[PDB]
Design a binder for this molecule. Structure first.
Ligand code: HEM
Ligand code: HEM
Ligand code: HEM
Ligand code: HEM
Lengths: 142, 146, 142, 146
């Protein structure tokens, strides 16, 4: 899977709308993941996962910033996310299944916040975009 | 499924605000658009050429109503999904040949539709309760496969 | 994930040893798949799936020949498998989850027939190779 | 889990020929080689840098034996996998923080190992019975996660 040109247009539009809320959305997506898919909590035993914790809010912001970086460099994600793909492959070692769960929760978060922009075609493009990000982040696993 | 009393009431409360025919058409249409391989069962439905064609197809909408009406009825039997969906499970396997992965995709699309429909009322805890329900329905429908 | 030169060597070596039995092993892998993961039978309502079925045998040969072609063109998989990517994306429309089930069954089949050759390193390279094949086959799904 | 008489006998018969010590070490070692991210739970085990290193590591072999011996115990209680593994399920969640997806990967590698070790005796029907068991065990171990 490769993002079509229309996909790139769709992503940039939706993300553009996220704008300054990217970090708050990143945080909500994580909280949605921890509650919906408790096994993901196994990767954060060192965090206070209480609702509104600074650890979750800060992590949420780092996730969103990396997503913003990927949108900005959609034409070359591999290079843009290189450092993050090394970190996840060599240090964090998150099983690849978990990427699908966070992607789903980010989609839900965007849906709940973008009433006007979350059309069927945008939903499709965002899903593909998150799948591509996930693919790049796990590409150096083995 | 095992839901706490709190979870069941969250599920039932939101469901009371749903227009089943509308959400049904939307969820089925979005399944077909977002995961196009699911269109394989629907070639007799006509034009599925574009997002607009899918979302506007009356056959898609009618099938969505049928599927979500059954789902809706299942919500009254949260305690016995397997029994409630047994015959439908057999049908989907033996006659329709639907890979049960499609039930899981539909469940995720449904959650996205509810989120889009309800905005902020679809809180993390409410989503969590619906995730359990959609996984429960998917499992109940896949139960009699062989 | 890309295949390293050692992966390529391992794959060519193992497949080299399959040789003329590739068709027989493709059939056995399907059989294993149908019995172990019954949901995969939903894509073959038109076949006789009984043990010994010539339809399964014939299909096993087609699958194996495609994998032989993939090994031969390991540096250029997307082009070599282009017609098969089109076929799967636009006509058969097999859910992507199924490719992991067949891949596992192919690995089991190889293990059962290549005791000497199925070392841990070869096992790893074959799993990566099947995942790459799987990725190419589903690349045009959306 | 629900096995037919033929499946239970398939499973039992083969398991009587398994040297747990040896198969356990092989299964754990191959997990660590094939899916290297799983090495995240074994930082204190020593050198895991190459296949040969992993496979000859005495701590890998020791742990492998521990795991398969507990696995063996479940074979004795196929009717109550959940009750059998409840204590270990809680351990793996609360103290070890092991993502249950790892139970699924080990189940698959174990199947590969049995096929490698047994050859033609590990027929399609025998594999099918073992796939049910391995899925049962993984579900039993993930059961107390929260
Ligand atoms: C869209 C997918 C993802 C993106 C863009 C992403 C991005 C990031 C970023 C930017 C960091 C911080 C690096 C730093 O501090 O320098 C990070 C760390 C981390 N990520 Fe990923 N991540 C993703 C998926 C996941 C998933 C699915 C999990 C597990 C369920 C996960 C677990 C972690 C953990 C445990 C850390 C370290 C947290 C800490 O100790 O501060 N990530 N990720
Ligand atoms: C919540 C999940 C679902 C429920 C409750 C459900 C329910 C139903 C019901 C009540 C019917 C009519 C059965 C009858 O004629 O007596 C039906 C038919 C059918 N369903 Fe499902 N379904 C679900 C998901 C799916 C999915 C995801 C697909 C494929 C993508 C699918 C494909 C079909 C097809 C092709 C038919 C036959 C339609 C016809 O003949 O007009 N279903 N389903
Ligand atoms: C390594 C992965 C796979 C390879 C290399 C492969 C290759 C092929 C080939 C070469 C054909 C014949 C095309 C022709 O007639 O020209 C085919 C057809 C087909 N494949 Fe795939 N396939 C793979 C995975 C799958 C999986 C996982 C499924 C479903 C469980 C599947 C379902 C089918 C079906 C239903 C057909 C049509 C069979 C018929 O009607 O004769 N394939 N595949
Ligand atoms: C068939 C599935 C498994 C069974 C039955 C099982 C069983 C066990 C047992 C009996 C122990 C020793 C507990 C004690 O200290 O009293 C243990 C420990 C442990 N297991 Fe599991 N296990 C399984 C799968 C896994 C997997 C797949 C992983 C990760 C890849 C894993 C990671 C660990 C770790 C990290 C420990 C602690 C070892 C130490 O203390 O350093 N286990 N397991």
């Amino acid at each position: 899977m490769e993002l079509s040109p229309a996909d790139k247009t769709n992503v940039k539009a939706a993300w553009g709308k996220v704008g300054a809320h990217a970090g708050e959305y990143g945080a909500e997506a994580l909280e949605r993941m921890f509650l919906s898919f408790p096994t993901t909590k196994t990767y954060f035993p060192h965090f206070d996962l209480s609702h509104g914790s600074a650890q979750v809010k800060g992590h949420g912001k780092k996730v969103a910033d990396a997503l913003t970086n990927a949108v900005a460099h959609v034409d070359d994600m591999p290079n843009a996310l290189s450092a993050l793909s090394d970190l996840h492959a060599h240090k964090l070692r998150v099983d690849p299944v978990n990427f699908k769960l966070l992607s789903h929760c980010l989609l839900v978060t965007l849906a709940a916040h973008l009433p006007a922009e979350f059309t069927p075609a945008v939903h499709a493009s965002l899903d593909k975009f998150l799948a591509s990000v996930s693919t790049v982040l796990t590409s150096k696993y083995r | 499924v095992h839901l706490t009393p709190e979870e069941k009431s969250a599920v039932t409360a939101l469901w009371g605000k749903v227009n089943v025919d509308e959400v049904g058409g939307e969820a089925l249409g979005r399944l077909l658009v977002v995961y196009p391989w699911t269109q394989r069962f629907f070639e007799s439905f006509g034009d599925l050429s574009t997002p607009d064609a899918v979302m506007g197809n009356p056959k898609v909408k009618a099938h969505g109503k049928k599927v979500l009406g059954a789902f809706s009825d299942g919500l009254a039997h949260l305690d016995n999904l397997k029994g409630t969906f047994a015959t439908l499970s057999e049908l989907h396997c033996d006659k329709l040949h639907v890979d049960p992965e499609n039930f899981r995709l539909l469940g995720n699309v449904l959650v996205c539709v509810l989120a889009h429909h309800f905005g902020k009322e679809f809180t993390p805890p409410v989503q969590a309760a619906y995730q359990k329900v959609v996984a429960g329905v998917a499992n109940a429908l896949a139960h009699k496969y062989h």
